[PDB]
């Protein structure tokens with residue numbers, strides 16, 4: 001257990017990602033929580049560039065950046081189920097969409113909370129909605145009618161996108177908007193249950209109300 005350590009704030013969509021990947025690979029690990037109010041020495045020494053989590057420590061050796069960590073886990077524990085797609089083009093598409101999520105979509109939805117007016121706030125909600133339209137189409141293309149972005153089995157892009165699901169639901173609730181519905185994102189609605197119910201996910205997947213109540217705690 002001790003030769004695999006995961007440094008992580010909790011709850012966090014980025015920290016969830018390697019927990020799921022480690023679950024898929026049936027890998028034994030110790031979870032070292034970063035607590036509010038302080039950055040640990042281990043953190044400051046493991047991730048001096050960004051001073052954030054997750055950090056996977058594999059043999060006293062730090063791997064930073066959640067998506068990089070998921071690929072590392074997939075490559076090292078190659079015995080287990082595959083996380084990335086096997087085909088180069090499918091892998092490129094999965095990486096493209098995970099990058100879009102982290103660079104454009106999630107930052108936009110995280111900015112809703114800080115908008116300075118109702119005008120600008122709905123502008124962001126509309127963009128988050130449009131992004132979900134794009135992701136619904138990506139899901140159709142990636143899944144091929146099977147259950148996940150990865151196809152029959154959960155995959156890299158399921159982990160990247162699904163890790164945000166609890167925060168999407170909390171932002172939906174606290175803004176009184178419905179961004180996933182059966183009209184605009186029918187496939188994602190179904191996948192959201194497939195993902196949250198998955199045995200590699202369900203025990204690390206946040207209750208929506210908990211995230212809402214937690215958002216309220218952070219307001220400081």
Ligand SMILES: N[C@@H](CCC(=O)N[C@@H](CS)C(=O)NCC(=O)O)C(=O)O
Pocket residue numbers: 008009010011012013014015034039051052053054064065066067
């Ligand atoms: N982009 C990073 C995640 C960045 C991030 O914002 N991490 C926060 C989420 S709460 C965190 O827990 N950082 C550790 C800390 O602040 O103590 C990744 O993909 O690895």
